[PDB]
């Protein structure tokens, strides 16, 4: 059945989900601040990650102000970072809303749709499949583009399909 779980993630920490995020599920990270002028990343200012039980980075959303880009990538816990998908102009993706923001990730089975506020910035074809068992928000107090603590809200058990058969 459908359920809502709330997690308050401090910068530099991660949490295990009470209910895994799977195909048809949604997770939204809410930030109470938007620091588009934060310190220089190294090279990341902020990273939002969806982890598989084996620690694989199912999806990482990395924000880089200096390089002015949002990187989407995946990799096994002991494997190399895979093919990066980039979105230029970090500020433009958040335009329209200041002092706060939200990043939503839809798990569509074959792809991860990421939406910054109301704007879909990418339909990311998965490079690694599997259910998300933990989330993380990594950054330092001085260079994060988001608030010290980011609230993650997962909407699980959502999957709804209408099967139409033909022959």
Ligand X SMILES: OC[C@H]1O[C@@H](O[C@H]2[C@H](O)[C@@H](O)[C@H](O)O[C@@H]2CO)[C@H](O)[C@@H](O)[C@H]1O
Binding site for ligand X (CB under 6 A): 43-44, 47, 60, 62, 71, 73, 81, 84
Could you say which DSSP state residue 148 is in?
A: S
Residue 80 is a binding residue for a copy of itself (CB under 8 A): no
CA nearest to 94, candidates 9, 16, 36, 11: 36
**Among ligand X, a copy of itself, none, residue 44 binds (CB under 5-8 Å by kind):** ligand X
Instruction: Return d(Cα 31, Cα 49) in angstroms, integer.
Output: 15
Instruction: Return d(Cα 117, Cα 26) in angstroms, integer.
Output: 14
Residue 130 is a binding residue for a copy of itself (CB under 8 A): no
Residue 95 is a binding residue for a copy of itself (CB under 8 A): no
Residue 113 is a binding residue for a copy of itself (CB under 8 A): yes
Residue 159 beta carbon to a copy of itself: minimum distance, rounded to whole angstroms: 5
Q: Give the H/E segment covering residue 105.
A: strand 101-107
CB atoms within 10 A of CB 160: 6
Is there a contact between 51 and 131 (Cβ–Cβ < 8 Å)?
Answer: no
Residue 165 is a binding residue for a copy of itself (CB under 8 A): yes
Number of residues that bind a copy of itself (CB under 8 A): 32
Is there a contact between 59 and 136 (Cβ–Cβ < 8 Å)?
Answer: no
**Among ligand X, a copy of itself, none, residue 97 binds (CB under 5-8 Å by kind):** a copy of itself
Question: Which range touches a copy of itself (CB under 8 A), out of 38-46, 68-76, 81-89, 117-125?
Answer: 117-125
CB nearer to a copy of itself: give 75 or 100.
Answer: 100
CA nearest to 110, candidates 4, 28, 2, 24: 24
Q: Alpha carbon 68 to chain centroid distance? A: 18
Residue with the shortest CB distance to ligand X: 73
List residues near a copy of itself by CB under 8 A.
1-6, 23-24, 26, 28, 97, 102, 104, 106, 108, 113, 115, 117-118, 120, 153, 155, 158-167
């Amino acid at each position: 059945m459908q359920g809502v779980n709330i997690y308050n993630i401090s910068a530099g920490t991660s949490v295990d989900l009470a209910a895994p995020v799977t195909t048809g599920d949604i997770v939204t990270f809410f930030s109470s601040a938007l620091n588009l002028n934060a310190g220089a990343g190294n090279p990341n200012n902020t990273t939002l990650n969806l982890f598989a039980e084996n620690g694989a980075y199912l999806l990482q959303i990395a924000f880089r102000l200096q390089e002015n880009v949002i990187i989407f990538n995946s990799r096994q816990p002991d494997g190399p970072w895979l093919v990066e998908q980039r979105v230029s102009d970090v500020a433009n993706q958040f335009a329209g809303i200041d002092g706060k923001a939200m990043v939503t990730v839809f798990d569509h089975g074959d792809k991860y749709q990421v939406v910054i506020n109301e704007k879909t910035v990418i339909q990311y074809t998965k490079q690694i499949s599997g259910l998300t068992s933990s989330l993380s928000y990594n950054a330092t107090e001085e260079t994060s583009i988001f608030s010290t603590v980011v609230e993650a809200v997962t909407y699980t058990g959502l999957a709804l399909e209408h099967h139409h058969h033909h022959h």
